[PDB]
Design a protein around this ligand. Sequence first.
Ligand code: ADP
Ligand code: ADP
Ligand code: BEF
Ligand code: BEF
Ligand code: BEF
Lengths: 95, 343, 152, 451, 48, 533
Amino acid sequence: SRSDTLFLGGEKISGDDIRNQNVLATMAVANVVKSSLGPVGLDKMLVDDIGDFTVTNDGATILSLLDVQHPAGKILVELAQQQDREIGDGTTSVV
Amino acid sequence: MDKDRKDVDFDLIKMQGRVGGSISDSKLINGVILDKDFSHPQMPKEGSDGVKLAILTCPFEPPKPKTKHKLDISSVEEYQKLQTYEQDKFKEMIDDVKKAGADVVICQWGFDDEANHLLLQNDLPAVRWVGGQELEHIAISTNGRIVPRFQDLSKDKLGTCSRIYEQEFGTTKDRMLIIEQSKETKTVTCFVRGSNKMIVDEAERALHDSLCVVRNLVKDSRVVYGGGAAEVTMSLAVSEEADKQRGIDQYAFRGFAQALDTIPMTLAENSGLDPIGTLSTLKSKQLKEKISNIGVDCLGYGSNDMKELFVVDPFIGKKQQILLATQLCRMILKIDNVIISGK
Amino acid sequence: MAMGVQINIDDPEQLEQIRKREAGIVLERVKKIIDAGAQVVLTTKGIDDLCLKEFVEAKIMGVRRCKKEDLRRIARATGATLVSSMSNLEGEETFESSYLGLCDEVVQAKFSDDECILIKGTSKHSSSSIILRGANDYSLDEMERSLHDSLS
Amino acid sequence: GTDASQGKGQIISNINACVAVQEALKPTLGPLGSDILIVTSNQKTTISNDGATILKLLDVVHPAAKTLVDISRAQDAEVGDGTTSVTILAGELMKEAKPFLEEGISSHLIMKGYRKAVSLAVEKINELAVDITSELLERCARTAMSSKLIHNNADFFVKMCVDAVLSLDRNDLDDKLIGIKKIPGGAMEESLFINGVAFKKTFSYAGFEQQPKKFNNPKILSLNVELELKAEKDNAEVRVEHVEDYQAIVDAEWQLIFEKLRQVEETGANIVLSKLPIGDLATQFFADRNIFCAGRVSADDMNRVIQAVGGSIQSTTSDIKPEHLGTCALFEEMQIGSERYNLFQGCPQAKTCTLLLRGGAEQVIAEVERSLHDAIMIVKRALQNKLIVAGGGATEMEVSKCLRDYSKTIAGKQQMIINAFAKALEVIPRQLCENAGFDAIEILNKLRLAH
Amino acid sequence: LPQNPNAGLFKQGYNSYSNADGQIIKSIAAIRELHQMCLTSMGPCGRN
Amino acid sequence: MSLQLLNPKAESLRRDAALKVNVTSAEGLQSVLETNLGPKGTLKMLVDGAGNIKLTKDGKVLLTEMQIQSPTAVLIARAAAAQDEITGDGTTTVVCLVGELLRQAHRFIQEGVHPRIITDGFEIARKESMKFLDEFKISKTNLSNDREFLLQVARSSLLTKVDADLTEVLTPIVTDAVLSVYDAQADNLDLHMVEIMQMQHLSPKDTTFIKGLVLDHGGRHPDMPTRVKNAYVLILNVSLEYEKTEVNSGFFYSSADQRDKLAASERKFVDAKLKKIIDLKFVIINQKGIDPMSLDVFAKHNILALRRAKRRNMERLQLVTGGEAQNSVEDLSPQILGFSGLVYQETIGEEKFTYVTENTDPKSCTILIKGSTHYALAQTKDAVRDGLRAVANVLKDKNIIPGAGAFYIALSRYLRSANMNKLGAKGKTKTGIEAFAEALLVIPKTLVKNSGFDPLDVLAMVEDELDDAQDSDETRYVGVDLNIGDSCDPTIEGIWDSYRVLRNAITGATGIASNLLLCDELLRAGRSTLKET
Ligand SMILES: Nc1ncnc2c1ncn2[C@@H]1O[C@H](COP(=O)(O)OP(=O)(O)O)[C@@H](O)[C@H]1O
Ligand SMILES: Nc1ncnc2c1ncn2[C@@H]1O[C@H](COP(=O)(O)OP(=O)(O)O)[C@H](O)[C@H]1O
Ligand code: BEF
Ligand code: BEF
Ligand code: BEF
């Protein structure tokens, strides 16, 4: 085992596990807002863990309120807020 | 370094990246670029039609002494004066700027706010907070000498240019100041672009390589053949100089045969090809054609000539690597015991 | 007083001779501006009670401390000029009727327990403001999201 | 970090959470809607039927439930009477619109289906229209008074309200210029309605009791200034290099104080209302001019007296003008018993209207004004918009039988939507009957035939 | 500082009362919970 | 309960136990520094609580940079430094002998020889040994002035570790280097006249030293002389940034904007001083930096300006291009001149670097030390430092003396001789004397045996034995050859060591053991909870 470096708190995933963790982390942030788009699509409500709510169908703003844990997910959140700069709409879809 | 001959060269080139866009968006600038934005409506901007810059230096606020300043007031009329008089020293200083006719002003610190108004109706995109130590690059670029103190601000240090640009289009709305073009020469800049900021701090990195690779050619002109080809030669050459070496330095040297084989092996294995496969076939092509052009090409998915397929790397590239790994091993091999204690 | 410019008096008996002088120079600038038009005054920093009475008696609508990002867009349409400092070249007070704007109506409307000042009509016909209205903040906000995302 | 409920499995928890809030308002409806004693924090304790205050002091955890309790005040500000009803309608509006969600194709077909509803319904809500004369408003202002504890004296209030509305007096009347003192004790019929401003301001002139108790034909000066030895705004420091420049400085103090009121008495003032207190020195130099002076008056208050009196508030007395003094009939500081209070009324064409009330404990009084406001406001609603509707839940049943008519006359799969909106409006009168039953249900069909 | 509403009529330990109409609305839903779970189960083309 | 005190948290390692704790650790610091002697020796990587790495073979380095709690140990660790200061090499020699000698002490107690009687012994042997060391002589105070072999001798000194294997180029580089600052160390002027710049590149081999100080400076303005040709210089140390008279002055303008005249006054008061410098004669150098304005005046008056010349450099700058570090230019120029050599600027290893191609009176110099790892250079600086200090002082005391063990056994032979008269005078004290020798002998064995493993020449038995049999005769001759594994004369072999060095390696040692054997007890008062952890 190892020795490699360096633990604890410092770790690394390799090849398959990462390429997977990356895809899962992406479908995560993705599959949440996969309902939004399309006229048939709906809106959602995000809770400020203090009661406060916020109803929105926007994909960009919705992903921001998510918190984006992980590099792969946050990478999409970053790609989202890019779209508003290009355009302003479709953030829900580009992801 | 063109027309200057070969030399050790340090990069004065400046690559600044805006997080907006994709890789390809990035482009060379025919002139100068600056990270700092304009004065914006602080304040009133770009780009003064035909332009004439200025490397303004020092403070720009109401004349204050580098010593204890205390404009005491005992009378009952010097109020008007004090306030009126200030508008003078901060005005004249401004007047002269336009007097010489330089279009633009550039100040690092302690500048003035009230004085911006007088500048507003003067058509000069005053720019503050410009790199304190940079003035060097900024100068050789815009051809404008630096201006220290207020009296000098002469028409001499004016940076003869034709246009200043402050764009904000294309994702993201964020803008960057572009300056073109300056009569002087010897400064080049490039603006990087990519989403996530990951691609910026990597497209930038993927340049300090491309760049340095060329200054390898400037520092020591010569190019070997990549694809592990350069490495393979040693396995053959060095091996012979071991047979006719005898003693104990035959196995040690044979070690450099056991070694260099990695570069081609991992190179090829990182593609999926058999480390045994291409290696073996390289041994032959090596002994047959003096490993002159032969090696492993990922694209070719086989063993063609590195030179034939334009696969090139500086002679320093792989030579300054070995010199290290060896002098390094020495260090590590000299280690016999490791103890710990506060240095 | 301008900072760093302390005030030590003597022999007077003149502490009062300039106390008001501190306020005078203020009003002197206030009037110099009121004397060019002064139908409506819009600052960003704000007007003072002791300097409102003056803009009040003249029946001049004054708004204490507005949004800087607004007075720009507003002045750009009314042809006015968002003035920074009083002094214009030297020596100047100053103000010129050439600084004021051109609109038709400056009416302070009402919208349910709230009221905002509107500015209808301009010299350059480039002014638009959509005032949404719905059930809850919960929706009236999202309605704006569909706006900011559709305008684009 | 945390989970989330989605789909119908959650779509429901949104609806039944909506119905939930309305459930706590069914009792409140006009007829015999019983008052609700709601204990709150910090130590607040209220009691009434006014939705946007019975819900206001009632916190809610759920999102939907938090959207409803918002419509309460979302409505009260706009008209200010549909407090209890809007919640009761909003809620029931989903209950009878729910089984068309799953059985219905989508949540969006219902959306469009609701537009054709509110559009048509608002129309029918306009059919039953009445015209307000603009005396006779006392007829409508009676209704706002009727639900709450104002019925016992439905008359007394209706007048006390349309009167306060009458004073101001602008195309749009801002009740920000209509103070409402609330003295404890006496009789609810003792709630006069001064045409000036009532102040808890005790015997003005804190120097001594010399200032007049009340003055006929007072010529007022309302000031936002300080009226005390002004200090250098520009941070100044003194240096007494002399030997007796100390006494001379001390003099410069009392001097400016005299020069202060000197130019303020020039406006022949006999009573001054300064937002800020006055120095004892400047409290005396003017006192010899037989002029009254009250300080500490509230910012908002000195605006009510700004319209009543008529004088314009001015700063820096030096630039004072004749157009700054006013004309009001009297200023008598009668004691409310143990506690003083300076009254000031009169003046022709005056907007301000302070309606002091009476009755029981400070809490009793509260619920009085609480519902009084519902009155005062209900008349402006009718005054700014001179047209009325057939109340008693009749208007409701109307748009119900009207939409209901539109129901069958619709060819589409989204028919089941307009229907829902209708069925839900019938419930508006439902409780009116259920609050005075038994029983509400039999009477329902009665109105359907009549309509 | 206060306040606190007392308890109208006490009893042993803890017990749960249910106003009938409220319970019907409330318990008619509990019932409704196991409904949507039994719907998809009945019939051939369904689910397990 | 008793208490019995004394005190808690305190312990009395007394008598023989004290004798143990005393001896029993001194040689502890043996197995630590044993590796360092002998060209065949090896280095040590040291870590710390700050997560750092040191891999160097120097002893002061492996003794100062260590954590130790046994007095004797720390004490010898202390003796390790004494050397590193007063001389470049011999710190390692000082300990190995120090310990080994003390090892031979805890041994005579197997015979029952009072410690004071062994101090008495070692005392005679100690001086009697140094004696013969004095007797060797061989100093090159007189011509042949070249004394190249002595320079070769320092290199012999620095042999082993990492640097020695490459060359043989260092001695030439150090030798020359010292020879410039030679006259300089005699004056009391330290070794700081020689600066070492780490611009790692290539291999510790390519490293080299250029004549004419190098500096990392400018040239902080584009409109400035990239290179200065033949131009003269000026070493100065006046204030350019504060720009304030040395007085408690507080300009107070009782008028309306009189500052406009004062804020220009001082802004010109610098121009006056600035104009004297313009007055002579060209480039300017000054410790205290030069603010954006003043420095931008020179730039336009054709005067390359160099700011922030560290104190070391200004002194160094005086050394090369013979200049005077004078600030006041109100008298200029009495006894105030600044010679110079072309000052072309050249970057090395991607780093800007201005060095003067041409210069005069080089009594100081910078030497670049390229390499392969930052860890490597850190250890080259020490090696150059050690060997660079040796040569330094050797030029202060010409007394030479052969290395490789010759010097050691020469001491050992001469010792055992008087010693083996030592018992007779007077008996038991003799063994102490005799024993002393065993030490100086043993260090040599450690040098090849336990340290000179390869080439395969390492036998503790044979080698030592060869010297004694073949060393009494060679008086200061017959050293060792840990390369081929033979006894060969160093003198024909360039094995030359400093007298000062190999003298102190004993002076220290001898002085150490003495005060240690004087130990009866040793006490301590705890400071940290526990801390057995
Ligand atoms: N070239 C050499 N061959 C054999 N022995 C040598 C040689 N040079 C020096 N020695 C001797 O070997 C020992 C170790 O080297 P030394 O100068 O003591 O380094 P350090 O004291 O810094 O550890 C000494 O006794 C020394 O003089
Ligand atoms: N006696 C009544 N019968 C039927 N409807 C009434 C009656 N009185 C008032 N209403 C109307 O029903 C409305 C809705 O109730 P609301 O005023 O919002 O709260 P509350 O009725 O409890 O005071 C009004 O009270 C009113 O316009
Ligand atoms: F939400 Be949309 F896509 F902007
Ligand atoms: F609640 Be009602 F309007 F008094
Ligand atoms: F310990 Be020495 F410096 F080799």
